[PDB]
């Protein structure tokens, strides 16, 4: 059998870019911060709870789905590009709307730990794993009005936890499903457009 649950993180953060000119591509840092995660998706055909007497195998993969473009409050498109993805695996590059970053750090791990192996949407749990930062750079449209900006960039981040009854178990949430996942994170990009 196979139980997969996606634990969605949803913290709000701000990044100050300062004074910028439309000929620049100001960057902003996206950090992965430990916190409370909410189940927003699952697929299970196995047991609901492990009482401690039995073994199962773990496969954990971190996910980040980031938009390639975001509308400013006043109605202007900002183009988001990956500047430094660190060790993250950038996949489904063909998509025209979102970036897909993954990082599998655990697989084939046998465990007897008692617990719920298929929590339902809405359930929570604490995540303490840390992952590399991802730095992006933004292209501002030349016609962007001067002034201060505080752009809300919503995105998805979380832990795909896969529990299975056999060694060698492998699973990846489909990209088309992932892109639809709730984007509970929010990066508030701050900057003052002084022309250019």
């Amino acid at each position: 059998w196979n139980n997969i649950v996606f634990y969605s993180l949803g913290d709000v953060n701000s990044y100050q870019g300062g004074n910028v000119v439309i000929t620049q591509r100001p960057q902003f840092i996206t950090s992965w911060r430990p916190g409370i995660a909410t189940v927003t998706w699952n697929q299970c055909n196995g047991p609901e709870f492990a009482d401690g007497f039995w073994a199962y195998y773990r496969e954990y993969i971190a996910w980040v789905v980031f938009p390639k473009k975001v509308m400013t409050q006043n109605g202007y498109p900002l183009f988001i590009e990956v500047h430094n993805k660190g060790s993250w695996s950038e996949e489904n590059t063909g998509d025209n709307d979102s970036y897909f970053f993954l990082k599998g750090y655990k697989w084939d791990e046998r465990a007897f730990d008692a617990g719920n192996l298929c929590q339902k949407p809405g359930e929570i749990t604490r995540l303490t794993e840390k992952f590399d930062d991802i730095i992006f750079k933004v292209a501002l449209p030349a016609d962007l009005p001067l002034g201060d900006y505080s752009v809300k960039i919503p995105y998805t981040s979380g832990m795909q936890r896969h529990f299975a009854s056999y060694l060698g178990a492998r699973f990846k949430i489909p990209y088309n499903v992932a892109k639809t996942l709730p984007r509970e994170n929010e990066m508030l990009f701050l900057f003052k457009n002084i022309g250019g």
Side-chain angles (χ1 to χ4, degrees):
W1 50 259
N2 295 264
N3 285 178
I4 308 86
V5 185
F6 186 73
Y7 292 90
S8 177
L9 284 170
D11 62 276
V12 184
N13 230 315
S14 285
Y15 189 88
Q16 180 52 261
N19 298 320
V20 301
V21 75
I22 58 77
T23 53
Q24 295 170 311
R25 279 184 160 174
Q27 65 166 55
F28 67 76
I29 301 172
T30 282
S31 297
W32 181 288
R33 303 184 307 175
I36 311 305
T38 305
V39 175
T40 62
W41 184 93
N42 74 30
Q43 178 192 294
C44 314
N45 64 5
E48 180 172 2
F49 315 96
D51 65 18
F53 284 123
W54 318 95
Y56 54 91
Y57 299 79
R58 297 162 164 159
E59 189 198 19
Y60 296 172
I61 306 176
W63 282 76
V64 168
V65 184
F66 215 81
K68 292 188 163 188
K69 182 185 299 176
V70 49
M71 293 303 286
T72 52
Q73 178 168 61
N74 53 181
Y76 292 80
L78 299 194
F79 305 72
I80 297 167
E81 306 179 285
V82 177
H83 181 230
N84 186 333
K85 70 182 179 192
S87 59
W88 285 94
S89 170
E90 188 176 355
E91 333 190 329
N92 200 205
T93 59
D95 191 86
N96 290 159
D97 305 293
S98 320
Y99 290 91
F100 299 79
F101 300 104
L102 294 69
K103 174 51 71 169
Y105 80 97
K106 182 184 302 303
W107 54 84
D108 298 344
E109 184 183 296
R110 177 168 64 53
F112 282 81
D113 299 57
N116 187 321
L117 301 193
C118 185
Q119 296 186 92
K120 305 167 189 294
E123 294 306 289
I124 64 168
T125 192
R126 180 176 300 296
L127 298 188
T128 54
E129 295 73 32
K130 172 74 176 178
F131 286 91
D132 213 342
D133 289 329
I134 293 181
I135 303 186
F136 300 87
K137 53 189 169 197
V138 184
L140 313 175
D143 51 315
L144 183 72
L146 309 306
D148 300 275
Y149 286 74
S150 186
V151 189
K152 287 182 177 297
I153 308 178
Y155 70 95
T156 301
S157 86
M159 187 61 73
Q160 172 193 300
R161 285 193 178 165
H162 173 200
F163 303 113
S165 63
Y166 62 94
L167 178 58
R170 299 281 181 287
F171 182 84
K172 304 186 64 175
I173 295 179
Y175 303 117
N176 74 81
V177 178
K179 64 177 181 181
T180 327
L181 289 172
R183 300 193 175 187
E184 316 190 295
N185 284 293
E186 193 200 84
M187 163 47 91
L188 193 55
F189 188 43
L190 312 163
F191 67 80
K192 183 186 294 184
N193 172 32
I194 56 183

PDB file of all heavy atoms in Angstrom, residues 38-51:
ATOM      1  N   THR A  38      -0.300  22.399   7.469  1.00  0.00           N
ATOM      2  CA  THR A  38      -1.661  21.897   7.356  1.00  0.00           C
ATOM      3  C   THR A  38      -1.773  20.960   6.161  1.00  0.00           C
ATOM      4  O   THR A  38      -1.242  21.248   5.096  1.00  0.00           O
ATOM      5  CB  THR A  38      -2.651  23.067   7.152  1.00  0.00           C
ATOM      6  OG1 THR A  38      -2.487  24.023   8.207  1.00  0.00           O
ATOM      7  CG2 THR A  38      -4.078  22.559   7.136  1.00  0.00           C
ATOM      8  N   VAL A  39      -2.456  19.836   6.336  1.00  0.00           N
ATOM      9  CA  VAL A  39      -2.626  18.893   5.239  1.00  0.00           C
ATOM     10  C   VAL A  39      -3.552  19.557   4.227  1.00  0.00           C
ATOM     11  O   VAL A  39      -4.605  20.057   4.598  1.00  0.00           O
ATOM     12  CB  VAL A  39      -3.293  17.562   5.721  1.00  0.00           C
ATOM     13  CG1 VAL A  39      -3.563  16.648   4.529  1.00  0.00           C
ATOM     14  CG2 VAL A  39      -2.397  16.854   6.750  1.00  0.00           C
ATOM     15  N   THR A  40      -3.163  19.575   2.959  1.00  0.00           N
ATOM     16  CA  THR A  40      -4.010  20.173   1.928  1.00  0.00           C
ATOM     17  C   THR A  40      -4.244  19.183   0.801  1.00  0.00           C
ATOM     18  O   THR A  40      -4.889  19.507  -0.189  1.00  0.00           O
ATOM     19  CB  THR A  40      -3.384  21.453   1.332  1.00  0.00           C
ATOM     20  OG1 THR A  40      -2.136  21.128   0.705  1.00  0.00           O
ATOM     21  CG2 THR A  40      -3.155  22.497   2.427  1.00  0.00           C
ATOM     22  N   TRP A  41      -3.704  17.977   0.952  1.00  0.00           N
ATOM     23  CA  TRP A  41      -3.856  16.940  -0.062  1.00  0.00           C
ATOM     24  C   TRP A  41      -3.307  15.603   0.433  1.00  0.00           C
ATOM     25  O   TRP A  41      -2.317  15.555   1.168  1.00  0.00           O
ATOM     26  CB  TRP A  41      -3.101  17.328  -1.329  1.00  0.00           C
ATOM     27  CG  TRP A  41      -3.270  16.364  -2.480  1.00  0.00           C
ATOM     28  CD1 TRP A  41      -4.203  16.435  -3.482  1.00  0.00           C
ATOM     29  CD2 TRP A  41      -2.464  15.212  -2.766  1.00  0.00           C
ATOM     30  NE1 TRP A  41      -4.018  15.403  -4.376  1.00  0.00           N
ATOM     31  CE2 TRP A  41      -2.959  14.641  -3.962  1.00  0.00           C
ATOM     32  CE3 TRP A  41      -1.370  14.609  -2.130  1.00  0.00           C
ATOM     33  CZ2 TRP A  41      -2.397  13.494  -4.535  1.00  0.00           C
ATOM     34  CZ3 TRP A  41      -0.809  13.461  -2.704  1.00  0.00           C
ATOM     35  CH2 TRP A  41      -1.326  12.921  -3.895  1.00  0.00           C
ATOM     36  N   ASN A  42      -3.964  14.521   0.035  1.00  0.00           N
ATOM     37  CA  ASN A  42      -3.499  13.194   0.396  1.00  0.00           C
ATOM     38  C   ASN A  42      -4.078  12.173  -0.561  1.00  0.00           C
ATOM     39  O   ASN A  42      -5.053  12.446  -1.256  1.00  0.00           O
ATOM     40  CB  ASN A  42      -3.854  12.836   1.854  1.00  0.00           C
ATOM     41  CG  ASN A  42      -5.339  12.526   2.061  1.00  0.00           C
ATOM     42  OD1 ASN A  42      -6.026  12.040   1.160  1.00  0.00           O
ATOM     43  ND2 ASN A  42      -5.828  12.785   3.274  1.00  0.00           N
ATOM     44  N   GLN A  43      -3.442  11.010  -0.607  1.00  0.00           N
ATOM     45  CA  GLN A  43      -3.865   9.892  -1.439  1.00  0.00           C
ATOM     46  C   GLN A  43      -3.438   8.670  -0.631  1.00  0.00           C
ATOM     47  O   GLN A  43      -2.238   8.445  -0.438  1.00  0.00           O
ATOM     48  CB  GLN A  43      -3.144   9.905  -2.791  1.00  0.00           C
ATOM     49  CG  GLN A  43      -3.511   8.727  -3.680  1.00  0.00           C
ATOM     50  CD  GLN A  43      -2.598   8.580  -4.874  1.00  0.00           C
ATOM     51  OE1 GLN A  43      -2.575   9.429  -5.762  1.00  0.00           O
ATOM     52  NE2 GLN A  43      -1.828   7.499  -4.900  1.00  0.00           N
ATOM     53  N   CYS A  44      -4.410   7.893  -0.151  1.00  0.00           N
ATOM     54  CA  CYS A  44      -4.100   6.729   0.678  1.00  0.00           C
ATOM     55  C   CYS A  44      -4.924   5.480   0.402  1.00  0.00           C
ATOM     56  O   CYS A  44      -6.122   5.565   0.143  1.00  0.00           O
ATOM     57  CB  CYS A  44      -4.291   7.078   2.153  1.00  0.00           C
ATOM     58  SG  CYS A  44      -3.564   8.659   2.653  1.00  0.00           S
ATOM     59  N   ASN A  45      -4.268   4.321   0.469  1.00  0.00           N
ATOM     60  CA  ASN A  45      -4.943   3.043   0.291  1.00  0.00           C
ATOM     61  C   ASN A  45      -4.466   2.068   1.369  1.00  0.00           C
ATOM     62  O   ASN A  45      -4.725   0.866   1.297  1.00  0.00           O
ATOM     63  CB  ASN A  45      -4.701   2.471  -1.110  1.00  0.00           C
ATOM     64  CG  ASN A  45      -3.243   2.138  -1.383  1.00  0.00           C
ATOM     65  OD1 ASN A  45      -2.382   2.233  -0.509  1.00  0.00           O
ATOM     66  ND2 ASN A  45      -2.965   1.738  -2.617  1.00  0.00           N
ATOM     67  N   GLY A  46      -3.787   2.611   2.380  1.00  0.00           N
ATOM     68  CA  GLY A  46      -3.273   1.793   3.462  1.00  0.00           C
ATOM     69  C   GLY A  46      -3.946   2.045   4.798  1.00  0.00           C
ATOM     70  O   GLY A  46      -5.049   2.587   4.852  1.00  0.00           O
ATOM     71  N   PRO A  47      -3.298   1.670   5.906  1.00  0.00           N
ATOM     72  CA  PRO A  47      -3.862   1.866   7.243  1.00  0.00           C
ATOM     73  C   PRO A  47      -3.875   3.337   7.625  1.00  0.00           C
ATOM     74  O   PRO A  47      -3.128   4.133   7.061  1.00  0.00           O
ATOM     75  CB  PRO A  47      -2.926   1.044   8.126  1.00  0.00           C
ATOM     76  CG  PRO A  47      -1.593   1.263   7.457  1.00  0.00           C
ATOM     77  CD  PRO A  47      -1.937   1.099   5.983  1.00  0.00           C
ATOM     78  N   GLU A  48      -4.723   3.698   8.582  1.00  0.00           N
ATOM     79  CA  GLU A  48      -4.811   5.085   9.028  1.00  0.00           C
ATOM     80  C   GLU A  48      -3.823   5.336  10.158  1.00  0.00           C
ATOM     81  O   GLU A  48      -3.207   6.396  10.216  1.00  0.00           O
ATOM     82  CB  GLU A  48      -6.237   5.410   9.496  1.00  0.00           C
ATOM     83  CG  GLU A  48      -6.427   6.853   9.982  1.00  0.00           C
ATOM     84  CD  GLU A  48      -7.888   7.199  10.259  1.00  0.00           C
ATOM     85  OE1 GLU A  48      -8.756   6.310  10.105  1.00  0.00           O
ATOM     86  OE2 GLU A  48      -8.173   8.360  10.631  1.00  0.00           O
ATOM     87  N   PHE A  49      -3.670   4.363  11.055  1.00  0.00           N
ATOM     88  CA  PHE A  49      -2.739   4.513  12.176  1.00  0.00           C
ATOM     89  C   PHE A  49      -1.768   3.339  12.320  1.00  0.00           C
ATOM     90  O   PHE A  49      -2.107   2.193  12.032  1.00  0.00           O
ATOM     91  CB  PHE A  49      -3.465   4.631  13.533  1.00  0.00           C
ATOM     92  CG  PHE A  49      -4.650   5.563  13.547  1.00  0.00           C
ATOM     93  CD1 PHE A  49      -5.947   5.065  13.372  1.00  0.00           C
ATOM     94  CD2 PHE A  49      -4.491   6.919  13.827  1.00  0.00           C
ATOM     95  CE1 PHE A  49      -7.065   5.903  13.485  1.00  0.00           C
ATOM     96  CE2 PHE A  49      -5.608   7.765  13.941  1.00  0.00           C
ATOM     97  CZ  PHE A  49      -6.894   7.253  13.772  1.00  0.00           C
ATOM     98  N   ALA A  50      -0.559   3.649  12.782  1.00  0.00           N
ATOM     99  CA  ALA A  50       0.463   2.649  13.051  1.00  0.00           C
ATOM    100  C   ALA A  50       0.491   2.678  14.572  1.00  0.00           C
ATOM    101  O   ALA A  50       0.754   3.729  15.167  1.00  0.00           O
ATOM    102  CB  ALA A  50       1.810   3.086  12.495  1.00  0.00           C
ATOM    103  N   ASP A  51       0.210   1.542  15.202  1.00  0.00           N
ATOM    104  CA  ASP A  51       0.168   1.491  16.660  1.00  0.00           C
ATOM    105  C   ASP A  51       1.505   1.249  17.334  1.00  0.00           C
ATOM    106  O   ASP A  51       1.559   1.089  18.548  1.00  0.00           O
ATOM    107  CB  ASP A  51      -0.831   0.430  17.128  1.00  0.00           C
ATOM    108  CG  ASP A  51      -0.418  -0.991  16.737  1.00  0.00           C
ATOM    109  OD1 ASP A  51       0.770  -1.217  16.420  1.00  0.00           O
ATOM    110  OD2 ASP A  51      -1.286  -1.885  16.765  1.00  0.00           O
TER     111      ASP A  51
END
